[PDB]
Amino acid sequence: VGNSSGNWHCDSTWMGDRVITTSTRTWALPTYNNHLYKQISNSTSGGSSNDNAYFGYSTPWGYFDFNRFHCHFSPRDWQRLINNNWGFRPKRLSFKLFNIQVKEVTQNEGTKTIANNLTSTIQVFTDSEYQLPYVLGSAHQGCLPPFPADVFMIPQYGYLTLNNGSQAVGRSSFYCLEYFPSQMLRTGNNFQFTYTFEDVPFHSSYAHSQSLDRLMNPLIDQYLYYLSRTQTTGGTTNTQTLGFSQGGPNTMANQAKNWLPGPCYRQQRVSKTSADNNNSEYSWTGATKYHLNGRDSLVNPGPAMASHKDDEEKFFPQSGVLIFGKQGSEKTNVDIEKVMITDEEEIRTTNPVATEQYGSVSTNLQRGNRQAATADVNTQGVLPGMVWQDRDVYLQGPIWAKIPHTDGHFHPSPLMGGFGLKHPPPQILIKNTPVPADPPTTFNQSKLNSFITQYSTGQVSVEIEWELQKENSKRWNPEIQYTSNYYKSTSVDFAVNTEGVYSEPRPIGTRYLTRNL
Amino acid sequence: VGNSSGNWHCDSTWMGDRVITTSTRTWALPTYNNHLYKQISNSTSGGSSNDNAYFGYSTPWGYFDFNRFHCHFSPRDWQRLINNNWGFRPKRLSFKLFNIQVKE
Amino acid sequence: VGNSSGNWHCDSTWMGDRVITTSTRTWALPTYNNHLYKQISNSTSGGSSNDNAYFGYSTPWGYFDFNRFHCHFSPRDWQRLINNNWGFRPKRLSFKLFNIQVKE
Ligand SMILES: CO[C@H]1O[C@H](COS(=O)(=O)O)[C@@H](O[C@@H]2O[C@@H](C(=O)O)[C@@H](O[C@H]3O[C@H](COS(=O)(=O)O)[C@@H](O[C@@H]4O[C@H](C(=O)O)[C@@H](O[C@H]5O[C@H](COS(=O)(=O)O)[C@@H](O)[C@H](O)[C@H]5NS(=O)(=O)O)[C@H](O)[C@H]4O)[C@H](OS(=O)(=O)O)[C@H]3NS(=O)(=O)O)[C@H](O)[C@H]2OS(=O)(=O)O)[C@H](O)[C@H]1NS(=O)(=O)O
């Protein structure tokens, strides 16, 4: 009661090959659903179409979500990681919950009184067996804020199950979170928890300096021929023939290659200048969307592909990018100066542009009378010989995602970026233990529905150790570093304004340093 | 005062030949009879026939009753016990009372 | 000649983490192709289209095929495996052939 449970550690430590980023924050937990598990469906949320239909449950539990890069790295630390390392991956995590206070608010006569209840507890358990629906990795809100000065409130845990419209099917499951071994904590008690990440590939935080279709020696020809000429060129009567040429420094497009660009699933190309777009509502009609059990879902951000070709910054794939929102930006139909559209153009070297055909394939058998026809390949699954890069990471974006427990998954790297994990950091769930108001003086079999209004607060630390892969570039000229532009501004970037509101002006990725292909 | 007395264990463990079902709950105890032992009879409850006649005492004490199968088994655990076993019987019990608060 | 070669084992054993399903059966083997290897083709089977065309050989040999789940599991054993386990895979196999009689 009169002794702190922990201290405030919120700094990074660089040990050459690794970096340990600690981050403490203050949280607040209200009582959700008034301590009840309520069944929710698309009909309770005000009904919807069949594509938006759902069936799940709300629970009285809140959960901690530190699955974003800005909860761990400061804008400076991120820049020191982005400009010097070629890859990075997390090694171990260490979550701690302390300095717990369970305040009891009693609203009597318009006058609000908040007093601490020293004997009240909170339950907090971590599902280490992944027996509960994993909700993190869906890019939801409620993360430790990016700025350490502010306090956040803990999001409410709710899960979904199978549905047939707004109804439940036979296999729909109901999970009671009270059926797990929680750990009651009064003020004075603390919660410590450690976790060590499985072996996941380093995140390639570099761009390639060579294009996958220009990996030859521009001074030498090949010893391999290709159909160069099919028709004797002129006379007056040019006829059918067969001429073969050797690929050379002038026919780089016709040369023979060993590899192919990564897979594709074509996207619609919209312009940031609305005057260049067709005047129709194609936000849903012209979108690329997978079909699953009769209902359509937006492929967004979809698999990994370049945003635009050379010199076309104005164009972005309709769904193929991560769009973050500037500070304070609303929720609905916000305009384009209220969001920050990421630019995945550094992978145009290996991955095909999201808004263009993958290739062209012959669709018939040319003959004396039939001539050579060809089609455009919009969707192209992997093939032996393909090579591609994964989506970037974004200091504001997600860190990991749980690889779904299926018996088949190809290249389980999350489409939103990050590290795909089969055993991701577990979900730390926490709620305020109910404290009933004065019960009747005569026995009533009915469950007590009157409770003492309370909420808890306290601090939370999260230490993560990251393994780095230092850059050993033997390049001669200088590289492209991330730098704060030297020009004078009204307010510093990644700093608080004159009202104390912290804001991240732009989305920072990792691909700055270059490397050969 | 500033330290919990116990934790929340409410799950079953299956060890092949036995199953241990734990179940934690939160209770509330009011003051009964205003701390008095009162003599009760069928006449105090508003009289009755001779078949419903009685004579007993009310006490200020409450009592814990976990004598029902649903206090221990969840509908799923009960189904896993009902579909696979031919018989079952209880072996040992372990009651615990903690995190006590006496509000005024 | 006057002594059996083996016994009839045809039951399953559940050891918690694994199940051993034994299954004995009686077979009969006739003489195929009259002891000859004959070349067969779609034309010998009465000709066909190009999609059904083939070329292979018939042999005088028979072969044992226990590649079906019902050769090992009984409808009850299969239900006891289907309702309680999340996955299963085979670990080892043990084939035995006995009590041979060559009737003429
Ligand atoms: C939409 O369908 C319609 O059009 C399509 C094509 O148009 S499209 O692509 O724009 O959609 C037609 O489909 C194409 O043509 C089909 C067809 O004509 O039947 C068919 O062609 C393939 O098979 C044909 C017959 O082959 S056979 O082995 O079954 O006989 C074939 O044409 C025949 O060529 C042979 C040949 O050149 O050998 C001819 O045989 C003659 O010569 C042989 C050898 O000559 S030699 O000198 O003696 O050595 C002799 O052995 C033979 O006795 C002799 N026959 S004889 O009767 O003239 O005496 C034969 O006569 C020809 O009919 C096609 O080859 S080709 O030579 O015509 O180029 C062959 N395809 S190919 O070789 O890859 O070109 C296919 O289904 C299809 O082929 S395609 O090239 O991909 O287009 C479709 O039939 C038509 N149907 S419709 O809409 O209902 O009218």
Coordinates of N, CA, C and O in Angstrom, one line a residue, chain A residues 43-183:
Chain A
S43 N -26.8 -7.7 -36.3 CA -28.1 -7.2 -36.1 C -28.2 -6.3 -34.9 O -29.0 -5.4 -34.8
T44 N -27.3 -6.6 -33.9 CA -27.3 -5.8 -32.6 C -26.5 -4.5 -32.9 O -26.8 -3.4 -32.3
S45 N -25.6 -4.5 -33.8 CA -24.8 -3.3 -34.2 C -25.6 -2.5 -35.2 O -25.0 -1.5 -35.8
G46 N -26.9 -2.8 -35.5 CA -27.7 -2.1 -36.4 C -27.9 -2.7 -37.7 O -28.1 -2.0 -38.7
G47 N -27.8 -4.1 -37.8 CA -27.9 -4.8 -39.0 C -26.9 -4.4 -40.1 O -26.4 -3.3 -40.1
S48 N -26.7 -5.3 -41.1 CA -25.8 -5.0 -42.2 C -26.1 -5.9 -43.4 O -27.2 -6.5 -43.5
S49 N -25.2 -5.9 -44.4 CA -25.3 -6.7 -45.6 C -24.8 -8.1 -45.2 O -24.6 -8.3 -44.0
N50 N -24.7 -9.0 -46.2 CA -24.3 -10.3 -45.9 C -22.7 -10.4 -45.7 O -22.2 -11.2 -45.0
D51 N -22.1 -9.4 -46.4 CA -20.6 -9.4 -46.4 C -20.1 -8.8 -45.0 O -19.0 -9.1 -44.6
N52 N -20.9 -8.1 -44.3 CA -20.5 -7.5 -43.0 C -21.2 -8.2 -41.9 O -21.0 -7.8 -40.7
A53 N -21.9 -9.3 -42.1 CA -22.6 -10.0 -41.1 C -21.7 -10.8 -40.1 O -20.6 -11.3 -40.6
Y54 N -22.0 -10.8 -38.9 CA -21.1 -11.5 -37.9 C -21.9 -12.0 -36.6 O -23.0 -11.6 -36.4
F55 N -21.2 -12.8 -35.9 CA -21.7 -13.4 -34.6 C -20.6 -13.6 -33.7 O -19.7 -14.4 -34.0
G56 N -20.6 -12.9 -32.6 CA -19.5 -13.1 -31.6 C -20.0 -12.8 -30.2 O -21.2 -12.7 -30.0
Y57 N -19.0 -12.6 -29.3 CA -19.3 -12.3 -27.9 C -18.5 -11.1 -27.4 O -17.3 -11.0 -27.8
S58 N -19.1 -10.3 -26.5 CA -18.3 -9.2 -25.9 C -18.0 -9.8 -24.5 O -18.8 -10.6 -24.0
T59 N -16.9 -9.4 -24.0 CA -16.5 -9.9 -22.7 C -16.2 -8.7 -21.8 O -16.0 -7.6 -22.3
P60 N -16.2 -8.9 -20.5 CA -15.9 -7.8 -19.5 C -14.4 -7.6 -19.4 O -13.9 -6.7 -18.6
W61 N -13.6 -8.3 -20.2 CA -12.1 -8.2 -20.2 C -11.5 -7.2 -21.1 O -12.0 -7.0 -22.2
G62 N -10.4 -6.6 -20.7 CA -9.7 -5.7 -21.5 C -8.5 -6.4 -21.9 O -8.2 -7.5 -21.3
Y63 N -7.7 -6.0 -22.8 CA -6.5 -6.7 -23.2 C -5.4 -5.7 -23.6 O -5.7 -4.6 -24.1
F64 N -4.1 -6.0 -23.3 CA -3.0 -5.1 -23.7 C -2.5 -5.4 -25.1 O -2.3 -6.6 -25.4
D65 N -2.4 -4.4 -25.9 CA -1.9 -4.5 -27.2 C -0.7 -3.6 -27.5 O -0.9 -2.4 -27.6
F66 N 0.5 -4.2 -27.5 CA 1.7 -3.4 -27.9 C 2.2 -3.9 -29.2 O 3.4 -3.9 -29.4
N67 N 1.3 -4.3 -30.1 CA 1.7 -4.7 -31.4 C 1.8 -3.6 -32.5 O 1.0 -3.6 -33.4
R68 N 2.7 -2.7 -32.3 CA 3.0 -1.6 -33.2 C 4.4 -1.2 -33.0 O 4.9 -1.2 -31.8
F69 N 5.1 -0.8 -34.0 CA 6.5 -0.5 -33.8 C 6.7 0.8 -33.0 O 7.8 0.9 -32.4
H70 N 5.8 1.7 -33.0 CA 6.0 3.0 -32.3 C 5.8 2.9 -30.7 O 6.0 3.8 -30.0
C71 N 5.4 1.7 -30.3 CA 5.2 1.5 -28.8 C 6.5 1.2 -28.2 O 6.7 1.3 -27.0
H72 N 7.4 0.8 -29.1 CA 8.8 0.4 -28.6 C 9.9 1.3 -29.0 O 10.8 1.5 -28.2
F73 N 9.9 1.7 -30.3 CA 10.9 2.6 -30.8 C 10.5 4.0 -30.9 O 9.4 4.3 -31.2
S74 N 11.4 4.9 -30.6 CA 11.1 6.3 -30.6 C 11.5 6.8 -32.1 O 12.2 6.0 -32.8
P75 N 11.0 7.9 -32.5 CA 11.4 8.3 -33.9 C 12.9 8.3 -34.1 O 13.3 8.1 -35.2
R76 N 13.6 8.6 -33.1 CA 15.1 8.6 -33.2 C 15.7 7.2 -33.3 O 16.6 7.0 -34.1
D77 N 15.2 6.4 -32.4 CA 15.7 5.0 -32.3 C 15.4 4.3 -33.6 O 16.2 3.4 -34.1
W78 N 14.2 4.6 -34.2 CA 13.8 3.9 -35.4 C 14.7 4.4 -36.5 O 15.0 3.6 -37.4
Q79 N 15.2 5.6 -36.5 CA 16.0 6.2 -37.5 C 17.4 5.6 -37.4 O 18.2 5.5 -38.4
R80 N 17.8 5.2 -36.2 CA 19.2 4.7 -35.9 C 19.2 3.2 -36.3 O 20.3 2.6 -36.4
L81 N 18.0 2.6 -36.4 CA 17.9 1.2 -36.8 C 17.7 1.1 -38.3 O 18.2 0.1 -38.9
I82 N 17.1 2.1 -38.8 CA 16.8 2.1 -40.3 C 17.9 2.5 -41.1 O 18.1 2.0 -42.3
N83 N 18.8 3.3 -40.6 CA 19.9 3.8 -41.4 C 21.2 2.9 -41.3 O 22.1 3.0 -42.1
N84 N 21.3 2.1 -40.2 CA 22.4 1.3 -40.1 C 22.3 -0.2 -40.2 O 23.3 -0.9 -40.4
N85 N 21.1 -0.8 -40.0 CA 21.0 -2.2 -40.1 C 20.3 -2.8 -41.4 O 19.5 -2.1 -42.0
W86 N 20.6 -4.0 -41.8 CA 20.0 -4.6 -43.0 C 18.9 -5.4 -42.7 O 18.1 -5.8 -43.5
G87 N 18.8 -5.9 -41.4 CA 17.6 -6.7 -41.0 C 17.5 -6.6 -39.5 O 18.4 -6.1 -38.8
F88 N 16.4 -7.0 -39.0 CA 16.2 -7.1 -37.6 C 15.0 -8.0 -37.3 O 14.2 -8.2 -38.1
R89 N 15.0 -8.6 -36.1 CA 13.9 -9.5 -35.7 C 13.9 -9.5 -34.2 O 14.9 -9.2 -33.6
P90 N 12.7 -9.8 -33.6 CA 12.6 -9.8 -32.1 C 13.1 -11.1 -31.6 O 13.0 -12.1 -32.2
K91 N 13.8 -11.0 -30.4 CA 14.3 -12.2 -29.8 C 13.5 -12.6 -28.5 O 13.0 -13.8 -28.4
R92 N 13.4 -11.7 -27.6 CA 12.6 -12.0 -26.4 C 11.8 -10.8 -25.9 O 12.2 -9.7 -26.1
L93 N 10.7 -11.1 -25.2 CA 9.8 -10.1 -24.7 C 9.7 -10.2 -23.2 O 9.7 -11.3 -22.7
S94 N 9.5 -9.1 -22.5 CA 9.3 -9.1 -21.0 C 8.3 -8.1 -20.5 O 8.7 -7.0 -20.3
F95 N 7.1 -8.5 -20.4 CA 6.0 -7.7 -20.0 C 5.8 -7.7 -18.5 O 6.0 -8.7 -17.8
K96 N 5.6 -6.5 -17.9 CA 5.4 -6.3 -16.5 C 4.3 -5.3 -16.2 O 4.2 -4.3 -16.9
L97 N 3.5 -5.6 -15.2 CA 2.4 -4.8 -14.8 C 2.5 -4.4 -13.3 O 2.6 -5.3 -12.5
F98 N 2.5 -3.1 -13.0 CA 2.7 -2.7 -11.6 C 2.1 -1.4 -11.2 O 1.4 -0.8 -12.0
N99 N 2.3 -1.0 -9.9 CA 1.7 0.2 -9.4 C 0.2 0.3 -9.6 O -0.3 1.3 -10.0
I100 N -0.5 -0.8 -9.3 CA -1.9 -0.9 -9.5 C -2.8 -0.2 -8.4 O -2.5 -0.3 -7.2
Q101 N -3.8 0.5 -8.9 CA -4.7 1.3 -8.0 C -6.1 1.0 -8.4 O -6.4 1.2 -9.6
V102 N -6.9 0.6 -7.5 CA -8.3 0.3 -7.9 C -9.2 1.4 -7.3 O -9.7 1.2 -6.2
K103 N -9.4 2.5 -8.0 CA -10.2 3.6 -7.5 C -11.7 3.2 -7.6 O -12.1 2.4 -8.5
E104 N -12.5 3.7 -6.7 CA -13.9 3.4 -6.6 C -14.7 4.7 -6.7 O -14.7 5.5 -5.8
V105 N -15.3 5.0 -7.9 CA -16.0 6.2 -8.1 C -17.5 6.1 -7.6 O -18.2 5.2 -8.1
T106 N -17.9 7.0 -6.7 CA -19.3 7.0 -6.2 C -20.0 8.3 -6.5 O -19.8 9.3 -5.8
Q107 N -20.8 8.3 -7.5 CA -21.6 9.4 -7.9 C -22.9 9.7 -7.1 O -23.9 9.0 -7.4
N108 N -22.8 10.5 -6.2 CA -23.9 10.9 -5.3 C -24.2 12.4 -5.4 O -23.3 13.2 -5.1
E109 N -25.5 12.7 -5.7 CA -25.9 14.1 -5.8 C -25.1 15.0 -6.7 O -24.6 16.1 -6.3
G110 N -24.9 14.6 -8.0 CA -24.2 15.4 -9.0 C -22.7 15.5 -8.6 O -21.9 15.8 -9.6
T111 N -22.3 15.3 -7.4 CA -20.9 15.4 -7.0 C -20.2 14.1 -7.1 O -20.6 13.1 -6.4
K112 N -19.2 14.0 -7.9 CA -18.4 12.8 -8.1 C -17.3 12.7 -7.1 O -16.5 13.6 -6.9
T113 N -17.2 11.5 -6.5 CA -16.1 11.3 -5.5 C -15.4 10.0 -5.9 O -16.0 8.9 -6.1
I114 N -14.1 10.1 -6.0 CA -13.2 9.0 -6.4 C -12.2 8.6 -5.3 O -11.3 9.4 -5.1
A115 N -12.4 7.5 -4.6 CA -11.6 7.1 -3.5 C -10.9 5.8 -3.8 O -11.6 4.9 -4.4
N116 N -9.7 5.5 -3.4 CA -9.1 4.3 -3.6 C -9.6 3.2 -2.7 O -9.7 3.4 -1.5
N117 N -9.8 2.0 -3.3 CA -10.3 0.8 -2.6 C -9.0 -0.1 -2.5 O -8.7 -0.8 -3.5
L118 N -8.4 -0.1 -1.4 CA -7.2 -0.9 -1.2 C -7.3 -2.4 -1.2 O -6.4 -3.2 -1.4
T119 N -8.6 -2.9 -0.9 CA -8.8 -4.3 -0.9 C -9.4 -4.9 -2.1 O -9.6 -6.1 -2.2
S120 N -9.7 -4.1 -3.1 CA -10.2 -4.5 -4.4 C -9.1 -5.1 -5.2 O -8.0 -4.6 -5.1
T121 N -9.4 -6.0 -6.1 CA -8.4 -6.7 -6.9 C -8.7 -6.5 -8.4 O -9.7 -5.9 -8.8
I122 N -7.8 -7.1 -9.2 CA -8.0 -7.2 -10.7 C -7.5 -8.6 -11.1 O -6.6 -9.1 -10.4
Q123 N -8.1 -9.2 -12.1 CA -7.6 -10.5 -12.5 C -6.9 -10.3 -13.8 O -7.3 -9.5 -14.7
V124 N -5.7 -10.9 -14.0 CA -5.0 -10.8 -15.2 C -4.3 -12.1 -15.5 O -3.5 -12.6 -14.8
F125 N -4.7 -12.7 -16.7 CA -4.1 -13.9 -17.1 C -3.6 -13.7 -18.5 O -4.0 -12.8 -19.2
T126 N -2.7 -14.6 -18.9 CA -2.1 -14.6 -20.2 C -2.4 -15.9 -20.9 O -2.0 -16.9 -20.3
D127 N -3.0 -16.0 -22.0 CA -3.3 -17.3 -22.6 C -2.0 -17.7 -23.4 O -1.8 -17.3 -24.5
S128 N -1.2 -18.6 -22.7 CA 0.0 -19.1 -23.2 C -0.2 -20.3 -24.1 O 0.7 -20.8 -24.8
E129 N -1.4 -20.8 -24.1 CA -1.8 -22.0 -24.8 C -2.6 -21.7 -26.1 O -2.9 -22.6 -26.9
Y130 N -2.9 -20.5 -26.3 CA -3.6 -20.0 -27.5 C -4.9 -20.7 -27.6 O -5.3 -21.1 -28.7
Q131 N -5.6 -20.9 -26.5 CA -6.9 -21.6 -26.5 C -8.1 -20.6 -26.7 O -9.2 -21.0 -26.9
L132 N -7.8 -19.3 -26.7 CA -8.7 -18.2 -26.9 C -8.6 -17.6 -28.3 O -7.5 -17.7 -28.9
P133 N -9.6 -17.1 -28.9 CA -9.5 -16.5 -30.2 C -8.4 -15.4 -30.2 O -8.5 -14.5 -29.4
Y134 N -7.4 -15.5 -31.0 CA -6.3 -14.5 -31.1 C -6.9 -13.3 -31.8 O -7.2 -13.3 -33.0
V135 N -6.9 -12.1 -31.1 CA -7.4 -10.9 -31.7 C -6.3 -9.9 -32.2 O -6.6 -9.1 -33.0
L136 N -5.1 -10.0 -31.6 CA -4.1 -9.1 -32.0 C -3.6 -9.4 -33.4 O -3.5 -10.6 -33.8
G137 N -3.2 -8.4 -34.1 CA -2.7 -8.7 -35.5 C -3.8 -8.4 -36.5 O -3.7 -8.8 -37.6
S138 N -4.8 -7.7 -36.0 CA -5.9 -7.3 -36.9 C -5.8 -5.8 -37.0 O -6.8 -5.2 -37.6
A139 N -4.7 -5.2 -36.5 CA -4.5 -3.8 -36.6 C -5.6 -3.0 -36.0 O -6.1 -2.0 -36.5
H140 N -5.9 -3.4 -34.7 CA -7.0 -2.6 -34.0 C -6.3 -1.5 -33.2 O -5.1 -1.4 -33.2
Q141 N -7.2 -0.7 -32.6 CA -6.7 0.4 -31.8 C -6.4 0.0 -30.3 O -6.6 -1.2 -30.0
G142 N -6.1 0.9 -29.5 CA -5.8 0.6 -28.1 C -4.4 0.1 -27.8 O -4.2 -0.7 -26.9
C143 N -3.4 0.7 -28.5 CA -2.0 0.3 -28.2 C -1.4 1.3 -27.2 O -2.0 2.3 -27.0
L144 N -0.3 0.9 -26.7 CA 0.4 1.8 -25.7 C 0.6 3.0 -26.7 O 1.1 2.8 -27.8
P145 N 0.3 4.2 -26.2 CA 0.5 5.3 -27.2 C 2.0 5.4 -27.6 O 2.8 4.8 -27.0
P146 N 2.2 6.1 -28.7 CA 3.6 6.2 -29.1 C 4.4 7.2 -28.2 O 5.6 6.9 -28.0
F147 N 3.8 8.2 -27.7 CA 4.5 9.2 -26.9 C 4.3 8.6 -25.4 O 3.2 8.3 -25.0
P148 N 5.5 8.5 -24.7 CA 5.4 8.0 -23.3 C 4.7 8.9 -22.3 O 4.4 8.4 -21.2
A149 N 4.5 10.1 -22.6 CA 3.9 11.1 -21.6 C 2.4 10.8 -21.4 O 2.0 11.0 -20.3
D150 N 1.7 10.3 -22.4 CA 0.3 10.1 -22.2 C -0.2 8.7 -21.7 O 0.4 7.7 -21.9
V151 N -1.4 8.8 -21.1 CA -2.1 7.6 -20.6 C -3.2 7.2 -21.5 O -3.9 8.0 -22.0
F152 N -3.3 5.8 -21.6 CA -4.3 5.3 -22.5 C -5.3 4.4 -21.7 O -5.0 3.9 -20.6
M153 N -6.4 4.1 -22.3 CA -7.4 3.2 -21.7 C -7.3 1.9 -22.4 O -7.1 1.8 -23.6
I154 N -7.5 0.8 -21.7 CA -7.4 -0.6 -22.2 C -8.6 -1.0 -23.0 O -9.7 -1.0 -22.5
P155 N -8.4 -1.4 -24.3 CA -9.5 -1.9 -25.2 C -10.3 -3.1 -24.6 O -9.8 -3.8 -23.8
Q156 N -11.5 -3.3 -25.1 CA -12.3 -4.4 -24.6 C -12.2 -5.6 -25.5 O -12.3 -5.5 -26.7
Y157 N -12.0 -6.8 -24.8 CA -11.9 -8.0 -25.6 C -13.2 -8.6 -26.0 O -14.1 -8.7 -25.1
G158 N -13.3 -9.0 -27.2 CA -14.6 -9.6 -27.7 C -14.1 -10.4 -28.9 O -13.1 -10.1 -29.5
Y159 N -14.7 -11.5 -29.1 CA -14.3 -12.4 -30.2 C -15.5 -12.8 -31.1 O -16.6 -12.6 -30.7
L160 N -15.2 -13.3 -32.3 CA -16.2 -13.8 -33.2 C -16.1 -15.3 -33.4 O -15.1 -15.9 -33.1
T161 N -17.2 -15.8 -33.9 CA -17.2 -17.3 -34.2 C -17.9 -17.4 -35.6 O -18.1 -16.4 -36.3
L162 N -18.3 -18.6 -35.9 CA -18.9 -18.9 -37.2 C -20.3 -18.3 -37.1 O -20.9 -18.1 -36.1
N163 N -20.8 -17.9 -38.3 CA -22.1 -17.3 -38.4 C -22.8 -17.7 -39.7 O -22.1 -18.1 -40.7
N164 N -24.1 -17.5 -39.8 CA -24.9 -17.8 -41.0 C -25.8 -16.6 -41.0 O -27.0 -16.7 -40.7
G165 N -25.2 -15.4 -41.4 CA -26.0 -14.2 -41.3 C -25.7 -13.7 -39.9 O -24.6 -13.7 -39.4
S166 N -26.8 -13.2 -39.2 CA -26.6 -12.8 -37.8 C -26.7 -13.9 -36.8 O -26.7 -13.7 -35.6
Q167 N -26.9 -15.1 -37.4 CA -27.2 -16.3 -36.5 C -25.9 -17.2 -36.3 O -24.9 -17.1 -37.0
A168 N -26.0 -18.0 -35.3 CA -25.0 -18.9 -34.9 C -25.2 -20.3 -35.5 O -26.3 -20.8 -35.6
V169 N -24.1 -20.9 -36.0 CA -24.1 -22.2 -36.6 C -23.9 -23.3 -35.4 O -23.8 -22.9 -34.3
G170 N -23.8 -24.5 -35.8 CA -23.6 -25.6 -34.8 C -22.2 -25.5 -34.2 O -22.0 -25.6 -33.0
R171 N -21.2 -25.2 -35.0 CA -19.8 -25.1 -34.6 C -19.4 -23.9 -33.8 O -18.3 -23.7 -33.3
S172 N -20.3 -22.9 -33.8 CA -20.1 -21.6 -33.1 C -19.7 -22.0 -31.6 O -20.5 -22.7 -31.0
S173 N -18.6 -21.5 -31.2 CA -18.1 -21.8 -29.8 C -18.3 -20.6 -28.9 O -18.2 -19.4 -29.3
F174 N -18.5 -20.8 -27.6 CA -18.6 -19.8 -26.6 C -17.5 -20.1 -25.6 O -17.4 -21.1 -25.0
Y175 N -16.6 -19.1 -25.5 CA -15.4 -19.2 -24.5 C -15.6 -18.3 -23.4 O -15.8 -17.0 -23.5
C176 N -15.7 -18.8 -22.2 CA -15.8 -18.1 -20.9 C -14.4 -17.8 -20.5 O -13.6 -18.7 -20.3
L177 N -14.0 -16.5 -20.3 CA -12.6 -16.2 -19.9 C -12.4 -16.4 -18.5 O -11.3 -16.4 -18.0
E178 N -13.5 -16.5 -17.7 CA -13.4 -16.7 -16.3 C -13.1 -18.2 -16.0 O -12.9 -18.6 -14.9
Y179 N -13.0 -19.0 -17.1 CA -12.7 -20.4 -16.9 C -11.2 -20.7 -17.1 O -10.8 -21.8 -17.3
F180 N -10.4 -19.6 -17.0 CA -9.0 -19.7 -17.1 C -8.4 -19.3 -15.7 O -9.0 -18.4 -15.0
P181 N -7.2 -19.8 -15.4 CA -6.6 -19.3 -14.1 C -6.0 -17.9 -14.1 O -4.8 -17.7 -14.5
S182 N -6.8 -17.0 -13.7 CA -6.3 -15.6 -13.6 C -5.4 -15.4 -12.3 O -5.2 -16.4 -11.6
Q183 N -5.0 -14.2 -12.1 CA -4.1 -13.9 -10.9 C -4.6 -12.6 -10.3 O -4.2 -11.5 -10.7

